[PDB]
């Protein structure tokens, strides 16, 4: 009956969703998509995510309803389970605000830092500096907020789940967290959670 099909890969955006699924205890199975073999481009997967990127899910119990965009998936699952996002207007919106900050800010900016710092054919220091500097500024925003509240929206939520897989890999991105004591507390808190440990292993 209840079954989420998860199409994913070992990346921060993929880990957002596997962590959420493990936190919520929903049954799911993995299709690990191989970049090398063009799998994310096949018409069969594009029928699920026309953007041809992971993660995406198909909710088998909802007439095989497809959801793409990690942030939209986190919302869909939170609403499905009633977990990790409060039901009240203000509580709901705090979560969505910080989820959007991750979706429009942290992910894209840290993603571009990775691109130029690690992947781009040519070393473009100005582009590297732009994105590491911007990523750091965003980390300082998070750090400030985490001085006011234990987790981004108050209690641990999909907002933290969206953001943590990115912060986790800051060194790879070439961005430091030193001096950000609230962010560090939060990093240590979330990395300790058994569901986070489990989700980080998916796909194997």
């Amino acid at each position: 009956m209840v079954m989420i099909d998860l199409y994913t890969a070992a990346t921060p955006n993929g880990h957002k969703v596997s962590i959420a699924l493990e936190e919520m205890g929903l049954p799911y199975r993995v299709h690990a998509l191989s970049f090398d073999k063009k799998e994310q481009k096949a018409p069969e997967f594009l029928r699920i995510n026309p953007n041809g990127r992971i993660p995406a899910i198909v909710d088998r119990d909802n007439d095989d309803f497809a959801v793409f965009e990690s942030g939209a998936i986190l919302i869909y699952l939170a609403e499905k389970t009633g977990q990790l996002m409060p039901a009240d207007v203000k509580g709901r919106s705090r979560v969505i605000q910080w989820l959007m900050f991750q979706m429009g800010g942290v992910g894209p900016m840290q993603g571009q830092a990775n691109v130029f710092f690690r992947y781009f054919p040519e070393k473009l220091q100005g582009a590297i500096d732009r994105y590491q500097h911007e990523t750091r500024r965003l980390y300082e925003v998070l750090d400030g907020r985490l001085g006011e509240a234990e987790y981004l929206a108050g209690d641990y939520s999909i907002a933290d789940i969206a953001t943590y897989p990115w912060v986790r890999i800051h060194d790879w991105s070439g961005v430091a967290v030193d001096g950000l004591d609230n962010l560090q507390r939060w990093i240590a808190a979330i990395e300790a959670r058994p569901a986070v440990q489990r989700g980080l292993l998916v796909p194997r």
Copy 2:
């Protein structure tokens, strides 16, 4: 007015002024002067710690602050029951395309703008990267727009979030030529009176 809007004449600000105009919500405009560093006044950071526009404060609701354009759109849609369906599939379709815009179109077209128009040096590889990625995202929109009249079916906050970016494609150096469905959608949306009004906020 029950809503205070902090904004500027950018695509992200326009998303929100279009939405307010569509929904018939009264609002007071606070046009932040970046020339005078108003986005860095401590008083504004208490509303949006990211120090960007737009942001709102809902005076009707204990002066609740909402930042992130995508989160403001969801907040306003839920408040009024307009421009996003109540049912599970319909609401998720809207959030999926909205997240597509917030994590994809806005960020990628925004970086095209940076390297094409504003960056201290001309890095042709960076310009190409983001203009190409932006066109690809437009192609995805165009495919979806063959399946439905608007991105989530009926016109919604997902279209409102996407249109102000697509509108300025030439500023970004990105063509919409050859994308008939996207072009149909452009023409439909630009003809909406609330869109015409929202694009004029704030006054010069």
